Amino acid sequence: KVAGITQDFTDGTTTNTGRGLDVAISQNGFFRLVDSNGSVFYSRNGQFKL
Amino acid sequence: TKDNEWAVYTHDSSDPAATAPTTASTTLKFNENGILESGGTVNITTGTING
Amino acid sequence: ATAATFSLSFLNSMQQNTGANNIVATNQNGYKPGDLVSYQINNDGTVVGN
Amino acid sequence: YSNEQEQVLGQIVLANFANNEGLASQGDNVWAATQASGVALLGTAGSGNF
């Protein structure tokens, strides 16, 4: 059988880039976004816009 | 216009001989629990074209 | 709108020198209206619509 | 601002779950919380276990 796809949730390399609107997270935690429909999602990829 | 009252106006867009709207068609009035209460049915005539 | 009156309870609190002040958990049972976007079936047999 | 004033516009909210490996990958670099993960448990970047 196939029980499930598991994911390795360890954080990785912190790489500097020098932009202004770029955030990273050093430990546990997720950014929290809403969509156009009101669905609430969670993320780790910090690269924003305007 | 005010809280829990709206006014709907009509226009006939597919013909150029339409009267300019000077009188609103009808008012809609609500509850304070957001439910429609009064003035929801109205008899409207269109314009005419091609006979 | 009809004004909301509600019973507010500070139960299960403590005063025991926990560094600074902090808020652990707030809960209330009201919601603005919405629409259905998805449904699913969990493992215990419950149909859950978000 | 241009009259030597500072204005806060909001604070970025982190959130973490009591159970990972229960999140569902839902497209792009984006997850989604369901059953077998729990409630959101959201806060700020300083205190807690964030």
C-alpha dist (Å) from residue A32 to B1, B12, B34: 38, 47, 31
DSSP string, C12-48: S---S--SS------------------EEE-SSS-EE
Touch D-A: 3+ C-beta pairs under 8 A = yes
What was the structure determination method? Answer: cryo-EM
* Nearest chain D CA: its distance from A6 CA (Å): 6
Token couple for C30: 């009201």
Contact B19, B37 (CB under 8 A): no
CA-nearest residue to C2 within chain B is B32
CA distance D12 to A33: 10
* Number of neighbours of residue D31 by Cβ within 10 angstroms: 20
Contact D9, D25 (CB under 8 A): no
Burial class (CB in 10 A: 0-12, 13-18, 19+), A40: middle
Burial class (CB in 10 A: 0-12, 13-18, 19+), A42: buried
A34, A37, A40, A41, best to mutate vs chain C, most C CBs in 10 Å: A37
CA distance D42 to D15: 4
Q: Is C37 on the interface with A (CB under 8 A)?
A: yes
Token couple for C10: 């500070």
Contact D50, A28 (CB under 8 A): yes
